[model samples]
Target: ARQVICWCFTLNNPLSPLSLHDSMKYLVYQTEQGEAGNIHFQGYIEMKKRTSLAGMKKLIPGAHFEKRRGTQGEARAYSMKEDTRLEGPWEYGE
Candidate 1:
């Protein structure tokens, strides 16, 4: 039977979750080339890491659980300025 299963987590916050300043729990998923109908949670993913920097100096490993709320929850962001390259040492890793 081709079926899809999904589960959501609800974190209770007194005044609502803060910005990306909390240890938020993100989700991780994986899918093969053509295995949409038959799907199962795979443990092959180790929550890969992503990092960027400005030259070899700003090579800092900073990862956080970020969530987009209201206008922040958009498909595309409005801030990817290339000219204002404050950090252009590297792109996202894994």
Candidate 2:
């Protein structure tokens, strides 16, 4: 049987509006199996930060912000069932 693994990440970019506007670029990457398996990458470059209420409004035009109330209760979540194979000689970015 094959074992399963999962990963989660969070990045923080705390920059001022002017600084972000100048040149704000963030790069992130993920690797598996000693850089031999699947590799994932993502990036984001915010033009500017939300300074004022009006600026925030302009930043996310037509975007809706909603707050949902949640309790301190805990719940379990499961992943969908799937098949797996252990074929060798798999490579990443090759």
TM-score of each: 0.18, 0.17
* lDDT computed for candidate 1: 0.22
Cα distance off (Å), candidate 1, residue 85: 2.5
Residues 1-94 of candidate 2 have per-residue lDDT tens digits of 5321221121122122211222222211222222245332211222223223343234334323221211111101211111222221211221
Stretches of candidate 1 exceeding 4 Å from the true structure? 1-22, 26-70, 88-94
TM-score of 2: 0.17
**What's model 2's lDDT at 8?**
17
Per model, how many backbone clashes are there?
A: 1, 0
lDDT of 1 by residue, 1-94 (tens): 3322211112121122112211222332222222243322211111212321221112112212222222232312322233432322221223
